[PDB]
């Protein structure tokens, strides 16, 4: 779930003779790699999301006041989904929480329903117009990691994200980066830009020791998968229970260069 639904759940509809603005708060506390979602407006509900490009732009402040580009404000943010429910509007948005080693920090978006009402007066208080707003606040707490992701940065030996890394002088015999992983472990790797990743859907499927592609769903169901093809960056989390010792591989390759092999040894654990 992890969803702020202002259409159906945190309803922003105005009520008969409502005269006073109302604000509702939807607080989400995702873990790393999890997906958060806002639903704001539909074919029948005329509600507007602020900033309009949320989550690509967010507000740093709960009072809706300091606009940030999330790719700069929460480094690593890169996976986004958007959906229109009515023409020329984006009403449903999602983003996946990237690994973050900086302290916890909020990000805000807002859903608004507006209307102008006439306040009928009397006895020396003339009638007036009043704009009222039902505002939904989306507060996402960006969690903090206390250890590096178990995995391989093939772009630098001074990685801030990954437990192991390789310098350009080393990647310029194949490199085989091995991680030993247990249940619920967060793993991943990053390959240089113009390298190809096999299988393309690494972590949904992978190479096995026979060198064959296998879909991992029935052997080792990695969860919360991020396949950032734009940045050649891959993350997932090991399942909550591991009943067998497994080894799987993904391979980054570029013509006339050594291959960069990522491997995981998953061990029995609960």
């Amino acid at each position: 779930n992890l969803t702020c639904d202002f259409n159906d759940v945190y309803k922003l509809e105005f009520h008969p003779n409502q005269q006073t603005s109302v604000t509702k708060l939807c607080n989400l506390t995702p873990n790393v790699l999890e997906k958060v979602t806002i639903k704001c407006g539909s074919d029948k509900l005329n509600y507007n999301l602020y900033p309009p490009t949320c989550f690509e732009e967010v507000y740093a402040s709960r009072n809706m006041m300091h606009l940030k580009k999330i790719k700069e404000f929460v480094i690593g943010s890169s996976m986004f989904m958007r959906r229109s429910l009515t023409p020329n509007k984006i009403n449903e948005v999602s983003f996946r929480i990237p690994p973050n080693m900086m302290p916890e920090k909020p990000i805000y978006c807002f859903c608004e329903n507006k209307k102008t009402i006439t306040i009928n007066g009397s006895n020396g208080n003339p009638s007036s117009k009043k704009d009222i707003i039902n505002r939904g606040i989306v507060e996402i707490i960006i969690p903090s990691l206390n250890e590096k992701v178990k995995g391989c940065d093939f772009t630098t030996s001074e990685s801030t994200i990954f437990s192991k890394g390789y310098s350009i002088n080393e990647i310029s015999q194949d490199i085989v980066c091995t991680v030993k992983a247990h249940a619920n472990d967060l793993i991943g790797f990053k390959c240089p830009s113009n390298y190809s990743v096999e299988p393309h859907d690494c972590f949904v499927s992978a190479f096995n020791l026979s060198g064959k592609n296998e879909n991992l769903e029935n052997k080792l169901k990695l969860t919360n998968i991020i396949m950032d093809h734009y940045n050649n960056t891959f993350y997932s989390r090991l399942p909550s229970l591991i009943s067998d010792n497994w080894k799987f591989f993904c391979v980054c390759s570029k013509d006339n260069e050594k291959k960069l092999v990522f491997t995981v040894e998953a061990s029995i654990s609960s």
Partner: nanobody
Amino acid sequence: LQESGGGLVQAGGSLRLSCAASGRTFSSYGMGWFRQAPGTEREFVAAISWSGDSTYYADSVKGRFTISIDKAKNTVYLQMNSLKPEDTAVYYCAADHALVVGGTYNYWGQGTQVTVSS
């Protein structure tokens, strides 16, 4: 790479294969035994982590073969028991990603032949 220890054995019997690596080229690597017979593809048999703390077996040999390692002498052993005619093949020692990287793997040796009579 020195691959040795193969030969002719009666069905039901045991053989112990040895793979001696006279270099540091393989100590970053998990190590595997692979096998191929005329008419079939090269297949995975068993692998062991560089520490020795982890082992993996092809389903068809689990419970009959054991892989083990002697790091001081850079040697990998495959102890084969209850041998089956199905096990007849040339056996090869290689880093355990050898089949993963395919045609770029540059250290395949001649291997050691194993024939199981019936």
